[PDB]
Amino acid sequence: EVAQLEKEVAQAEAENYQLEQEVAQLEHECG
Amino acid sequence: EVQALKKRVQALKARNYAAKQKVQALRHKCG
Numbered sequence: 001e002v003a004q005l006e007k008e009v010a011q012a013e014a015e016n017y018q019l020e021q022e023v024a025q026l027e028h029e030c031g
Numbered sequence: 032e033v034q035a036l037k038k039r040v041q042a043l044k045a046r047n048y049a050a051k052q053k054v055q056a057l058r059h060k061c062g
Contacts, residue, residue, distance in 0.1 A: 005036035012043030019050030023057060030061030 002033055005033060009036055009039050012047050016043055016047050019054055022054045023050055026057030030057060
């Protein structure tokens with residue numbers, strides 16, 4: 001369902017947003 | 032669009048999958 005996919009996209013987006021923050025930080029401190 | 036959101040999910044998961052590995056790789060590298 002559209003609603004299901006939307007909650008799934010929002011799920012991925014939420015994680016994605018965090019992953020990029022952590023990667024940027026970890027790289028900024030290490031990389 | 033269902034088909035549209037599905038590709039959104041896949042695109043996100045594709046980036047999420049890569050980012051997740053990066054975060055954990057970075058946690059190993061400098062965690």
